[PDB]
Design a protein around this ligand. Structure first.
Ligand SMILES: *[C@@H]1O[C@H](CO)[C@@H](O[C@@H]2O[C@H](CO)[C@@H](O)[C@H](O)[C@H]2NC(C)=O)[C@H](O)[C@H]1NC(C)=O
Ligand SMILES: *[C@@H]1O[C@H](CO)[C@@H](O[C@@H]2O[C@H](CO)[C@@H](O)[C@H](O)[C@H]2NC(C)=O)[C@H](O)[C@H]1NC(C)=O
Ligand SMILES: *[C@@H]1O[C@H](CO)[C@@H](O[C@@H]2O[C@H](CO)[C@@H](O)[C@H](O)[C@H]2NC(C)=O)[C@H](O)[C@H]1NC(C)=O
Ligand SMILES: *[C@@H]1O[C@H](CO)[C@@H](O[C@@H]2O[C@H](CO)[C@@H](O)[C@H](O)[C@H]2NC(C)=O)[C@H](O)[C@H]1NC(C)=O
Ligand SMILES: [Fe+3]
Lengths: 362, 646
């Protein structure tokens, strides 16, 4: 259902508010109609993706802006500088959000977005697909819902029933796919085929795409909140940021691609490990050294890598390398610093700020 | 023991109702000391925490491209880490936050110092004349509109043990008293004792100012029930909260110079201080201090002629090298720099977000204001001077002056006929005009209110129209008609100051014929929108639980077929009827919301009656926070833009 999608050009015939289309789809689904429900569900999914991409494009345009040079006197007053810069950012974001068409319709409520993030409409979509003789699409929808939620019961029985049906053994595809996971799968397949250059090219293409996606998912995570108490300035904003920080730290593991039903651990570490092994197999140390440095940064304990790092160090210039080849890549530094700082901030916050007035129910 | 003050106030009031004077004096003194201790503790903690962890700033960076998002993430994380550390220390210092939340009513009764009246009564009951006269004097100074307590301290002065020097205030701040004493005692042309007091009156001011700046970080001020549908992002919450905090900070320089004896705040406080100081210094003969004071005044208004002459005369009399030697006072320079930067930020916020602000100082240079605000101010001054010239010419052409000058307008829109003027309607500031809109518009408004419904604001109607429940043209017509009625009603009354909204909602009344049995009581008692009328007392009160900023009021009807539910104007006694207006289609009634115009509505009979009510204020501080949102929404929906996605 993602075939006829284009962020640059979106047909105006299907620009309705998200809740209206979703409610119409459910009302038709309860009314035993199938084709109309299928079309409306596809419309709703497309609209949600367009809204997400519009938010991403809006938040990439504003933050990545040059900092204006202020007057000499204003540099002596820190708080005014900081909040003036933040105010300029907010004004630019508000001005640029009156743009893209998807932001000129009704704003969905929090619960609709919450359930859409939970990928629940795919269940109704798969039932509708079954009721309209589109078996590969139904299989794909069932697998797509199963990937996010692997502990359910009825979906397992449905998937077993579909697998029992003949022919349905190759259309198992993830509808909500991303670029970097496909690139990673292709790179791993090439690596196991003892092919090196293709692995390097595809993996290097994969790296910055994942970094960009992760930064976007961090940026768009600063959602709203429901007001439930009145406090002073500092406390009543610190609580908001504590909640946002929780939802932020719950972001790295979500983006992790899964294969064989077991999500991989230390994804960037695996990336750099494969890159280093390929570069070593190509005997180009000039690129090999930074990968080893970065992975050893990400994991402080590994005998194998300490050994070959020492062996690398034993040949100071035998391969012809300089001191500019024993420091980590900038991107890995950025990622590691962001992750560590978020972890430390949450750890510090969950000792003093939030009130301890709720306990386990006995 | 740091107990909540309103509980002690209630206990003391109950004891006074019983009449136990020792109880009431104990309770009132405990409550006052509790408030003082609470304020001191909050100030000390909030001013120590922000000084223990200074605000950091390390902006030295130049990002290589495509290495851009990471820098933003790092900067944001560092800033919020600093904020979190500050908040942690502040929370660990302050303590239990329940006691600090008190409603308004005790705030107003604290402002009026009624507990001091209770103390004076109690102290007289127990023969404590010194404290009794102290309380009487401080209540008189706080509110000098009670002749009875004037007789009270006169009778207190009749019996012995009372001295003139015993009249000591207990509530007014030190700097204001010192400044007033200095000015008064310099008025006798005695220059010596003038210099020290004013100098003291200088220093305290700055210190006092600091404390106000540390008592402005308070809870957000939601517009009543608007927190149920609040949907602001984090970076919107920061901006809104900080803008409100900055506004409340900058509002302090118009409060530190407002004494309750005077009806209006003093003007140009610090420059007046410096002017009096320089005059006294010259009279005493401290010449260098005099040239210093003149120079530091000249830093505020750089274009004053008399003081230019004074400085020139001092510089000609004195050696020029000494005139060059001394510059302006450093503290005034620092204060000016801080205030100017704050004003620049606030004016940018006013330009962009449409959050109103009014300058409290008269010395700002005109380079800190954006262009659009300058153009709007020029237009406002132009229309004000035009109205002044028109009214002057009209007076030259001449209750009659009020009846012929304050109303009678152009009626700029066509099709409007003055039906009932002030002279016919038996009173002042009443207008009844017909044909504001045609029947079609009334029909669409009735359809809008019938489709969905007592609380449909223009913003809510536009939002529902955007959603799709109600047709959009009806909402657009509603917005246009409310703007039209604002314009015409404002222009009819010859108002120089621009007019602003305060509330505007549509309503419908549905007669319930099954509950009309023995319903002889009026639908709504006669009252006034500005104040609260206490019926038989025949006296109003500008009491904050009743809105005191609404100035003009207007109502327009839509339907033309029912019975009952008329509209009438009633005198202050709440008995006699002065005039009545028969409802019809397109009828508009407008009046000033002052105490001179009490309005009344009769009960309704069979049918439905729907109409729109509107209230306008003249103070730009009190404008809706949803009108700008509605304007932005209409600009969204009916003024589309385009930007290249490729
Ligand atoms: C970010 O958004 C701004 C907001 O419109 C855009 O900036 C435009 O930049 C181009 C050249 O870089 C100018 O010709 C336009 O006049 C700018 N538009 C303005 C000022 O409104 C643009 O979409 C983005 N800027 C980038 C990508 O540099
Ligand atoms: C996070 O950023 C900081 C500053 O931008 C850097 O911290 C330095 O890290 C190196 C090793 O990575 C140390 O030798 C330096 O002593 C650190 N300096 C400071 C001031 O902490 C680095 O880019 C990132 N941090 C780490 C630990 O890598
Ligand atoms: C002008 O008034 C001051 C006020 O005391 C006189 O004394 C000076 O006080 C200031 C306060 O720090 C200091 O400059 C010195 O302690 C004092 N002397 C001088 C020369 O400033 C001062 O003497 C007076 N000047 C004249 C010419 O009478
Ligand atoms: C109220 O809204 C506008 C504001 O006057 C009225 O006129 C519209 O705005 C443009 C701008 O000048 C006019 O040229 C058009 O006549 C109107 N717009 C369109 C798209 O026709 C508008 O007519 C009023 N509302 C109604 C329902 O009449
Ligand atoms: Fe009323």
């Amino acid at each position: 259902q993602y075939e006829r999608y284009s962020f640059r050009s979106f047909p105006r015939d299907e620009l309705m508010p998200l809740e209206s289309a979703y409610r119409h789809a459910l009302d038709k689904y309860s009314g035993e109609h199938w084709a109309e429900s299928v079309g409306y569900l596809e419309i709703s999914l497309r609209l949600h993706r367009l809204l997400r991409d519009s938010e991403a494009f809006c938040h990439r345009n504003c933050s990545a802006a040059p900092q204006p040079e202020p007057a000499a006197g204003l540099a002596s007053y820190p708080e005014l500088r900081l909040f003036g810069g933040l105010l300029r950012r907010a004004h630019c974001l508000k001005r640029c959000k009156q743009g893209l068409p998807a932001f000129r319709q009704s704003q969905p409520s929090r619960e609709v977005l919450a359930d859409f993030q939970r990928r629940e409409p795919y269940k109704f979509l798969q039932f509708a697909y079954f009721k309209a003789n589109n078996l590969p699409k139904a299989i794909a929808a069932a697998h797509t819902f199963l990937l996010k939620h692997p502990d359910d019961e009825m979906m397992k029985r449905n998937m077993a029933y579909y697998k029992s049906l003949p022919g349905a053994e190759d259309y198992i595809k993830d509808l909500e796919t991303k670029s970097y996971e496909s690139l990673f799968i292709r790179a791993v397949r090439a690596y196991n085929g003892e092919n090196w250059r293709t692995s390097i090219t595809d993996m290097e293409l994969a790296l910055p795409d994942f970094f960009k996606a992760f930064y976007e998912c961090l940026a768009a995570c600063e959602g709203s909140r429901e007001i439930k108490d009145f406090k002073d300035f500092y406390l009543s904003i610190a609580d908001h940021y504590v909640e946002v920080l929780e939802c932020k730290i719950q972001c790295e593991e979500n983006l992790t691609p899964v294969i064989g039903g077991y999500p991989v651990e230390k994804f960037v570490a695996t990336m750099y490990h494969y890159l280093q092994f390929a570069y070593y197999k190509l005997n180009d140390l000039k690129n090999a050294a930074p990968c080893a440095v970065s992975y050893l940064l990400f994991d402080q304990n590994d005998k194998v890598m300490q050994q070959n790092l020492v062996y690398y160090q034993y040949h100071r210039d035998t391969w012809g390398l300089s001191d500019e080849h024993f420091q980590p890549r900038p991107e890995a530094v950025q990622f590691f610093n962001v992750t560590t700082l978020q972890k430390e901030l949450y750890d510090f916050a969950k000792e003093n700020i939030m009130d301890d007035d709720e306990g386990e129910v006995v | 023991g740091m107990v909540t003050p309103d509980l002690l106030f209630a206990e003391g009031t109950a004891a006074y109702a019983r009449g136990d004077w020792p109880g009431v004096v104990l309770s009132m003194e405990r409550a006052l000391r509790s408030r003082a201790a609470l304020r001191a503790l909050r100030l000390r903690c909030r001013t120590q925490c922000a000084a223990d962890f200074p605000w950091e700033l390390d902006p030295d960076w130049s990002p290589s491209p495509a290495q851009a998002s990471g820098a933003a993430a790092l900067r944001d994380l560092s800033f919020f880490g600093g904020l979190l550390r500050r908040a942690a220390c502040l929370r660990r210092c302050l303590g239990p936050p329940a006691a600090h939340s008190l409603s308004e009513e005790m705030e107003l009764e604290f402002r009026k110092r009624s507990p001091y009246n209770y103390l004076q009564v109690a102290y007289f009951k127990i023969n404590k004349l010194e404290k009794a006269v102290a309380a009487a004097h401080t209540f008189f100074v706080g509110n000098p509109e009670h002749m009875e307590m004037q007789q009270n301290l006169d009778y207190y002065q009749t019996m012995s043990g009372v001295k003139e020097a015993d009249f000591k205030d207990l509530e007014t701040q030190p700097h204001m008293q010192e400044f007033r004493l200095g000015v008064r005692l310099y008025s006798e042309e005695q220059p010596q004792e003038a210099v020290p007091h004013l100098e003291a009156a200088l220093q305290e001011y700055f210190v006092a100012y600091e404390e106000c700046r540390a008592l402005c970080e308070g809870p957000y001020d939601y517009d009543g029930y608007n927190y149920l549908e609040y949907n602001a992002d984090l970076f919107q919450a920061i901006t809104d909260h900080y803008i409100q905090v900055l506004n409340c900070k900058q509002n302090c320089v118009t409060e530190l110079a407002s004494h309750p004896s005077r009806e209006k705040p003093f003007e140009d406080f610090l420059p007046s201080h410096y002017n009096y100081l320089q005059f006294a210094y010259y009279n005493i003969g401290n010449y260098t201090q005099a040239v210093e004071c003149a120079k530091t005044y000249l830093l505020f208004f750089p274009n004053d002629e008399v003081m230019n002459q004074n400085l020139a005369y001092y510089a000609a009399m004195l050696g020029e090298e000494h005139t060059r030697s001394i510059g302006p006072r450093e503290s005034a320079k620092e204060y000016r720099q801080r205030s100017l930067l704050e004003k620049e930020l606030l004016f940018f916020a006013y330009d962009v977000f449409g959050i109103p602000f009014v300058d409290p100082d008269s010395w700002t240079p005109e380079e800190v204001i954006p262009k659009r605000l300058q153009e709007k101010q020029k237009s406002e001054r132009e229309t004000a001077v035009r109205i002044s010239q028109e009214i002057g010419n009209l007076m030259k052409e001449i209750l009659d002056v009020s009846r012929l000058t304050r109303e009678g307008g152009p009626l700029l829109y066509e099709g409007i006929s003055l039906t009932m003027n002030s002279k016919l309607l038996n009173g002042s500031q009443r207008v009844v005009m017909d044909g504001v809109i045609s029947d079609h518009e009334c029909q669409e408004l009735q359809r809008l209110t019938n489709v969905a419904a007592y609380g449909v604001t223009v913003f809510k109607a536009l939002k529902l129209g955007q959603e799709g429940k109600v047709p959009l043209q009806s909402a657009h017509l509603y917005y246009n008609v409310t703007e039209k009625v604002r314009r015409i009603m404002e222009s009819y009354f010859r108002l120089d100051t621009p007019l602003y909204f305060s509330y505007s909602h549509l309503v419908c009344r549905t007669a319930i014929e099954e509950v009309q049995a023995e319903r002889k009581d009026d639908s709504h008692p006669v009252h006034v929108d500005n104040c609260i009328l206490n019926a038989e007392t025949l006296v109003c009160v500008k009491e904050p639980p009743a809105y005191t900023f609404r100035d003009y009021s207007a109502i327009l009807y839509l339907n033309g077929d029912f019975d009952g539910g008329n509209f009438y104007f009633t005198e202050l006694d709440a008995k006699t009827v002065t005039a009545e207006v028969q409802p019809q289609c397109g009828r508009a009634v407008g009046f000033s919301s002052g105490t001179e115009n009490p309005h009344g509505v009769k009960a309704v009979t069979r049918g439905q009656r729907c109409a729109i009510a509107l209230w306008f204020t003249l103070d730009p501080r009190h404008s809706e926070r949803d009108r700008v949102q509605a304007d932005d929404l209409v600009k969204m929906l009916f003024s589309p833009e385009e930007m290249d996605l490729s």
